[PDB]
């Protein structure tokens, strides 16, 4: 679908059996979600953005569904102020910027 940017591009995502609202962010390298439980192994990671860095848990090969489009990839979980879907997953659903 074509998403305009007049408003924040928020979408519903299905992950870990849960439904969450997340921001499609082309400027984000990774996908980071607020505290939640995910299965499998994980490793600590520090990610930075405006304001500095925050520590998160990195889970790889996590199944995810965005706007009906299924994909799998790395999901970071930590004290992020808002849920963000990064390029690592945007690519998988064939998302592109156009103008």
Ligand X SMILES: CNC(=O)[C@@H](NC(=O)[C@@](O)(CCCN(Cc1ccc(-c2ccccc2)cc1)NC(=O)[C@@H](NC(=O)OC)C(C)(C)C)Cc1ccccc1)C(C)(C)C
**Residue 23 binds its own copies, judged by CB under 8 A:** yes
- Residue 51 tokens, joined: 């304001």
Q: Please tell me whether residue 78 binds ligand X under the rule CB under 6 A.
A: no
Angle at 93 between CA 30 and CA 80, to 5 degrees: 25
User: Measured between alpha carbons, how far is 30 from 88 in angstroms, rounded to an integer?
Assistant: 6
30 part of the active site: no
Question: Which one of the spans 13-21, 25-33, 37-45, 57-65 is the region binding its own copies (CB under 8 A)?
Answer: 25-33
Q: Please give the torsion angle defined by the CA atoms of residues 50, 53, 55 and 61, in that order, rounded to the nearest 10 degrees.
A: 60
Interface residue with ligand X among 10, 11, 36, 47 (CB under 6 A) is 47
91 binds, among ligand X, its own copies, none (CB under 5 to 8 A by kind): its own copies
Q: Report how far residue 85's alpha carbon sits from residue 42's, in angstroms, rounded to the nearest whole number.
A: 19
- Residue 83, SS3? coil
Please report whether residue 10 would count as binding ligand X according to CB under 6 A: no
**Residues with catalytic roles:** 25
Binding site for its own copies (CB under 8 A): 1-6, 8-9, 23-29, 32, 47-54, 67, 69, 80-81, 84, 87, 90-91, 93-99
């Amino acid at each position: 679908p074509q998403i305009t940017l007049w408003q924040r591009p928020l979408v519903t995502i299905k992950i870990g059996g849960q439904l969450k609202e997340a921001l499609l962010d082309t400027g984000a390298d990774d996908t980071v979600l607020e505290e939640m439980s995910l299965p499998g192994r994980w490793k600590p990671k520090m990610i930075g953005g405006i304001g500095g860095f925050i520590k998160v848990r990195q889970y790889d090969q996590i199944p995810i569904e965005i706007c009906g489009h299924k994909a799998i990839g790395t999901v970071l979980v930590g004290p992020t102020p808002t849920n963000v879907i990064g390029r690592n997953l945007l690519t998988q659903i064939g998302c592109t910027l156009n103008f």
